[PDB]
Structure formats: C-alpha cells, structure tokens
Amino acid sequence: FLSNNSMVLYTDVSQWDSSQHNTQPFRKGIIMGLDMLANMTNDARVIQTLNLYKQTQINLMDSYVQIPDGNVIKKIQYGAVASGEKQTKAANSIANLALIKTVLSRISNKYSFATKIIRVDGDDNYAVLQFNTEVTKQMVQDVSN
C-alpha cells in the first residue's frame, strides 16, 4: 500500500523495557483478562493454571535485580519487563500493538486517514496509512511531531 497518497510511520521500540507503560498497566491488563477467563471456564486444572500465571504476573510487578559492582552487590527496584521469559515476545507484541492503536487514534483529531496495516516484531514496528488526498512535506512533518 505504498503510494503517493500513503505514508508509513516506523519506530524503534527496543528501549521500551524500563518504560512506564510496561510496568503496572501492562501486567494488570493480563491479570484482568485472566480473571475473565477464569469466570469463562468450569474445569479446575485450567483455573489453577490461570491463577499461577496470574500470580506470576503479580510477582513480576515487583522485581529486584542482582547486579554486582566489584565486591558488593546492588539490588534495584525494577518493576518492568525484559527478556528471559516464555512470555516476553508475544506480550511485547501485544502491548506495542495496543499502544500504537491507542496513539494512532489521536492523529485522527487532526487528519483523515485509513489504517491499512500494522506490524510489530520485537525491536521495531511499522504502520502504513492512506489519505483522502496526496501527500506533502508538511503533513509528514506534522504527523511525525
């Protein structure tokens, strides 16, 4: 969908691990979804599994980090996300997708466009979007800002 009328915004998202949007809201969304799913089943092994994944999300919400410096050891409050987990990949894709869906509904306050495609893969993400008219330099500038 590249054309004279369309543009594409691409963005690196690799620094977004200590960020304020991968802390509490990210974890609590999953906890809420798990609550819904627990009330959406009748078997008990499944509810146990869901409660364990939930408690994992509870504990990862407060997480300290052994880091040496010479002889003594620092431990820092880091209630956020990183790799080293079975979950990090798909969940980061989810959260980045939701984030861009949320931001991209604000350019609509000032532009008319039709979101043609969104893609998220780890350390980057790109969304293409098409306009009612032909593109200019100033729309690119203002969209970016």
Partner: protein, 795 residues
C-alpha cells in the same frame, strides 16, 4: 557478605477491575431476623413552667427524637428522609419471633416480660420517679405477656411512639414466611421431573407444621433485556451457556477409536500412492470432541446462544454430517453466513452434481439460503421433502409452568427425521454423476454409506439429545428468548463427525443432583434479579416523589448491576444506565416498599416539626406581636399556623438567586414570612428582648446576599432567665417582632403509648429446600422417552 540498595517510586495505576462471579458462585441470600424494634423517638424529662412563666416543683415527660441530625435546607431534609427509607429497608425484617428480644419487667405483679430493653428501661424509670401518679404504676404492674400455645401465638407489651408502632406493626403483619410440609417440597420440584419415570424420589423426614419457608420471587424479566440491550444480553447468555456446559453429561463407553477407524479404513479402501479426498474424512475423529459437540449443542440450545461453523471443504464428511446437524438442530440457532456457506458446499458437491446440474450461481446477500432455492429446482420427492423439513425446522415457543420454552418439533424428538435423511442419502447413492468422474462418485457414495451404516445409532443419538435437552430445560426459571447474540461459539463439524461416528448403546441421563443444582442456581440468580429490580425501582420512585432534582440516577443503576454479579460495570456507559432507568421508572413497586414509603411520606413532616436544631420558617412582622405561653418553654416567640403573612420560599431563592424581592421587602419594612429549614439560638435573656435583637439578624442579607448565615432568635423566658423580676412585678405580657415558625413537643402518655404486639411462637426456617429429597435413576439402558418407548435401543 555485603549488599547495596536502590529504589524507585513507581506510580500506582489502579484499574476499576469490576469484581465478578459466576452463577454457581452466587450466594442465595441470608434472611433478616429482627433486632430491636426500630425506634425514632424516646421520652425525656423536661422542666415545666406555669403561666406567668415561673416554674413548678414538677417535671414532665415529652417525646423527643433520637439522634437529632436534620439538615439546613429543605432539599437536604428530603435527602434525610430518602436515607431513612433506605435504612428502614435495610432493617425491614423477613421473620421475627418476639420472645428472642423480650426481657423481664422488674416491677410486674405476675413477674412478666415485655418486648424490648428500652421498654423496660422506660417502665423502670417511670416507676421509680417520685412525681408519677400511682395509676401509671398500677398500669406497669398489670402489663405482662400472654401466651396461647394452641395457636402458637404470643402477645407482648410494648411502649413506643405511634410512628414506631406503625412501622413495627407493618413488619409483623407482613413477614414473608409460609408453612412448610413435604407436599411443598414436592411441588417446589418441577412437574416434568416428577412426571418422569426415569427418576425416583423419596425422603426420610416428616416436617411439622411448625416449620416455615420463604418463597422465591420467580417473577419474569420486567425489563426486556433481550429488547435493545444486546451487550448485556450477550453477557447473560454466555454466563448461562457456561453453566449449562457444567451439567451436560459426559458420554459413557464409546466404541474403540482405533477399532472404528481401522474399520473405516477398510470400508474406504485407501491407497498409499494417491491423495484420496476420502483420507480427509479421518481428520479429527477423536473422542473429547464428540463430548464437546454433545455439550455445545445442548448448552447453546438451552442458553439461546448462537453458534457458528468452521469446516474445510476438502473434507466432505464434515458436510455429510452437517446434513444431520442442520436437520436435528434449527437453522436460526446458527448464524446465517456460516450455514449459508455449509449449505452451498453441500449443494455444490453432493446434490447438484448428483442430479446432473450446473454448479450454482449464488449471490452473497441472496434473500434465500441455498436449501430454499434448491428445494424447488430438484425433482425428487425424498431429497426435496428433506430440504423442505430443513428449511421449515424451527423452534416452537410455548409457555409451560410459567417459563417460556423453545421446544423441538416432536418429530425430531422421536428420531424419525433421520429416516427422511437416510432415504435422501440412498436416493443420492443411486444417482450417477453425468458430469463428474467415477472416482468422485465413489468418494461421495462411500462417505454417505459410512453414515447410512449408522441408522440406529443416529436415531438413538437424536432421541438422546432431545431427551437431555428437554430434561435440562425443565430446570429453568428465566424465560428463554430466541434472539441472535453479538457473538458465537465455534462448532467444528469434525466434532460432529466424531459424535455421529463414535456412539452406541450406552445412555447418559442427567443425575438428579445436577438437575437440582442447575435449578437452584437459576432460582438464586432470578430471585436476586427480581429483588434488586424492586430495590432500585423503590429508590427511583422515592426520589421522584420528593423533587430531589439535583440527584443523578447513575450510582443506583451501578449498584443494581454490581449486585448482578456477572457484568462489567466499570465499562458499561452512561446512556445505557439511563435507558435502564427509563425502563425501571415505569415498573410497579412491591407492596412492602410502597407501604413503608407511604408511611414515611405521611409522617416525615411530623418528624421534622420536632428536631429542635432547625425551625420551619420565620415570620417578620414590623408590629409588636405577643409571645405565646407554653409549659416546656415559658413565654416564647413561637408560631405554628403561619396564617396572614405572605411567604417566600428559600430553596427557590437559592436556586435562582434573585434577591430583588427579599431586598425590597426588607428595606421598606414590609411584613413577610421566610419558609425553609433554619437553625436558631435560644436567647434565654430578657434584656435582649426589650433591646429587640431578633430583628437585627436580617440586615446582613442585603449586604451579603447569601441567606445561609441566617439564624433567628427564640425568646424562651421563665424563672431561669436572670431578669424575671420584671415579668413578675411590672405586669407586662412580653411582646416581640419576628416570631419563629415551629411546633412544640408532644406530651408523653404512658397509658395510650402502650400497645400489645402479637406474633407467633417458636417456628423454624429452612432454606436449602431440596436437601430433604433423595433421588436416583433407573438403569440408563432401561430408560424411556416421551413416547413411552426405550431410547437408545436400535443396534
């Protein structure tokens, strides 16, 4: 060993989280037994002052309020009374035995009892007072408890204000308990389950007539939530669907999968060196999906949740089993585009290629589904009659035992439809494919033979589904409407083929305990629904009968939905709450609540004339009026009629601040009244009377317009006022401008305030009513259906 520490103040994002439950986890109710008798008034000794103002050597008992808490401003007073109505409904008991709350009078002749602790407190105080007549002491000595055990009735004395008597007597005469016997244990169970000879029932107890039981409010949906609240309806529908899945039986011994599928392989005559569409027929013929389809169909048809289909056209057996499906399950029960696709596939790969036709020329939004158009193009009685049945298969809406029911044809229940189906499939096997090659004939005819060699098992399956469906339908209280939901459940036709190909001569009947559990759960949800509707309707109709115009009727609906412990209240918008309110307004209030509210209406003014913190107005007459004689005050500047002078309302003045009228009337010394609740101070002096202070209070109103810092003066004058020698000697009746609009206390009549409260003696209350019933089933092979004929018999 050594450590270091660092920290970071993370923000605290709190969602609303909308704490949920499911139907089986909804707790029914906990009955209210009554505490103390809900007093609003109490007696009190006050001094008394004879005319001329001076004092007796005697006192007197007057009624006064407990907890003077009333506000300033009439709007806030009506708020007060709405809150009081909420309190009474929070205290409105369900049953009550007076002996539990009774205590012993320490001064009765016959050593008798009375009803409440404060009753006896009052009796003892008035008995031990020096200045009480002997006659009230005689009264206190004669007043005792009477009992008649032939009728299980008691009568206890009480002492309480007439409003209090009204409330308590209403509670007594309208306590919702009913005599309990085993006949009611039976008749609480549905008819269809008692009338079913596949269940046997007994009990090992004989309850007495001394027992009691509360009857649920199984009144229907007043709100019509199927009418234009499709989100709430989808929620409710899924939340009943899940309950229904919990109760459908797991299937018994199925045929051995490996054996059945080796037999299928033999009957298909596969080849290791071709593709053979026949191979895909084996796709997903496991168990655990047969059960899944068996469960999904029944739970959908009971919950009235639509369900969609997924099926790969390379697998023709999926279609060949979807035939059976579409026969025995209605079509509006499925979502349209799904069965459109399925019927189109069925046509364009079993039927029109068999009778030698064009493939099809079908439009997406064609107003006819493909079976309807194909009903008339073909010329063959069997297949055409089959398609007729399929197109005109739909539920029958019938109201039985109070509940609506979506009943099947009664030709599906008795499996005979399968005979139409098998005749159609035999008359398709016999066709040639003039257009299409012989391998394709072989594939199709072979597939439909795999299902034609299961005639008896399929008849039996259909009868079994019908039986379990009706048997579980019998355990429903909320009427079951047929309107499509936003959202579907994915049904796989592989699971259908698994079911139809893995079943035989083993019957599953619902255990009576599952039935009773499903019934009690639907009851608890339904009764909660009705009781909460009645709550909210009561509060709404209350607030509109008091002109509480600033109140915004949103939190009420939110409470109503929270108490319905399945919805997401934090993400239902406001328009929907307001439409729900619009429906709630039009409903009748139950009798208990309407009566209590009528009581509060008729006596709220009387409660408000009391409360000596606020007065009901103030007069201003630029005239030297007289002071009134009373005998709990002395000479007072009090008014109780408000005749004459014209009155300004103050809430009307607070709303629309236009002080031109009040200001002009004050400047030009025009007489006026000011009506609205207003505090005051009690100036017990005299030198502040001749000095005429109570007129000084109004000159602030012109400078600062807010009439809220407004407190009239109340000139109570007596022998306890430091300057009473003036009123004693000089012989002048005191006179004052600016009287206060207010009422006096009511004298306490011990005799007439005594009443006799009547009630029962020693009943018992039972809740889980189906606990006394034991139930069991006949052997499942020796079962029987509506037709009085063993189901699951054909081999």
């Amino acid at each position: 060993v050594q450590y270091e520490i660092l920290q970071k103040t993370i923000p605290t994002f709190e969602p609303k989280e909308s704490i949920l439950k499911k139907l089986e986890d909804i707790k029914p109710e906990q009955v209210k037994k009554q505490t103390k008798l809900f007093r609003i008034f109490e007696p009190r000794q006050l001094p008394v002052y004879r005319a001329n103002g001076e004092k007796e050597l005697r006192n007197r008992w007057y009624w006064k309020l407990k907890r003077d808490t009333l506000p300033d401003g009439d709007y806030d007073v009506r708020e007060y009374f709405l809150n009081l109505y909420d309190q009474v409904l929070t205290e409105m008991p369900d049953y009550l035995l007076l002996k539990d709350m009774a205590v012993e009078n320490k001064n009765s002749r016959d050593a008798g009892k009375v009803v409440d602790s404060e009753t006896a407190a009052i009796c003892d105080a008035i008995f031990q007072d020096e200045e009480t007549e002997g006659v009230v002491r005689r009264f206190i000595a004669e007043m005792r408890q009477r009992v008649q055990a032939d009728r299980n009735v008691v009568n206890y004395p009480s002492i309480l204000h007439p409003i209090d008597h009204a409330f308590n007597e209403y509670f007594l005469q309208h306590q919702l308990v009913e005599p309990l016997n085993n006949d009611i244990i039976f008749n609480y169970i549905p008819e269809r389950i008692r009338n079913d000879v596949n269940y046997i029932l007994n009990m090992d107890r004989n309850l007495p007539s001394t027992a009691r039981y509360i009857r649920p409010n199984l009144l229907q949906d007043r709100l019509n939530l199927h009418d234009n609240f499709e989100s709430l309806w989808d929620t409710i529908t899924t939340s009943n669907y899940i309950l229904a899945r919990s109760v459908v039986p797991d299937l018994k011994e199925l045929v051995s999968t490996e054996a059945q599928i080796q037999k299928m392989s033999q009957d298909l005559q596969l080849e290791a060196l071709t593709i053979q569409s026949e191979t895909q027929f084996l796709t997903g013929i496991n168990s655990q999906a047969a059960n899944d389809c068996f469960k999904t169909l029944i739970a959908a048809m009971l919950s009235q949740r639509t369900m969609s289909l997924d099926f790969v056209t390379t697998n023709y057996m999926s279609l060949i089993s979807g035939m059976w499906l579409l026969t025995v399950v209605p079509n509006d029960m499925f979502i349209r585009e799904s069965l459109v696709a399925c019927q189109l596939a069925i046509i364009n790969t079993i039927i029109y290629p068999a009778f030698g036709m064009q493939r099809m020329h079908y439009r997406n939004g064609d107003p006819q589904t493909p079976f309807q158009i194909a009903e008339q193009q073909i010329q063959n009685f069997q297949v055409a009659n089959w398609l007729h049945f399929v197109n005109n298969n739909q539920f029958r809406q019938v109201v039985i035992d109070g509940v609506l029911n979506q009943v099947l044809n009664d030709n599906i229940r008795n499996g005979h439809v399968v005979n139409q189906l098998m005749e159609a499939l035999m008359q398709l096997s016999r066709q040639q494919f003039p257009t299409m090659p012989v391998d394709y004939k072989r594939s199709i005819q072979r597939g439909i033979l795999l299902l034609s060699n299961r005639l008896g098992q399929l008849v039996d399956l259909t009868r079994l589904l019908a039986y379990n469906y009706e048997t579980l339908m019998a355990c429903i209280t909320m009427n079951m409407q047929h309107v499509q939901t936003l959202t579907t459940e994915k049904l796989q036709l592989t699971s259908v083929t698994s079911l139809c190909m893995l079943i035989g001569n083993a019957t599953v009947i619902p255990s009576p305990q599952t039935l009773f559990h499903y019934y009690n759960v639907n009851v608890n949800f339904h009764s909660n629904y009705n009781e909460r509707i009645n709550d909210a309707v009561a509060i709404i109709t209350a607030a509109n009968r008091l002109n509480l115009y600033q109140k915004k009727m949103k939190s009420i609906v939110e409470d109503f939905l929270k108490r319905l412990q399945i919805f997401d209240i934090s993400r239902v918008p406001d328009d929907q709450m307001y439409r729900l309110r619009d429906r709630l307004r039009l409903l009748p209030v139950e009798i208990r609540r309407l009566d209590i509210f009528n009581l509060i209406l008729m006596n709220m003014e009387q409660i408000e004339r009391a409360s000596d913190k606020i007065a009901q107005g103030v007069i201003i007459a630029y005239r030297d009026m007289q002071l009134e004689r009373d005998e709990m005050y002395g000479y007072v500047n009090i008014a109780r009629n408000l005749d004459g002078f014209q009155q300004i309302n103050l809430e009307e003045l607070m709303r629309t601040g236009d002080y031109a009228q009040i200001t002009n009337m004050l400047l030009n010394n025009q007489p006026v009244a000011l009506v609205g609740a207003l505090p005051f101070i009690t100036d017990s002096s005299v030198i502040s009377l001749v000095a005429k202070l109570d007129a000084t209070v109004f000159a602030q109103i012109v400078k600062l317009r807010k009439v809220d810092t407004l407190k009239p003066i109340l000139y109570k004058i007596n022998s306890d006022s430091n300057d009473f020698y003036l009123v004693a000697n000089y012989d002048w009746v005191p006179t004052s401008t600016t009287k206060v609009y207010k009422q006096i206390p009511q004298q306490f009549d011990f005799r007439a305030s005594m009443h006799m409260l009547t009630s029962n003696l020693t009943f018992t209350v039972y809740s889980d009513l189906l606990a006394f019933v034991s139930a069991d089933t006949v052997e499942p092979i020796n079962a029987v259906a509506f037709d009085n004929m063993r189901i699951m018999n054909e081999l």
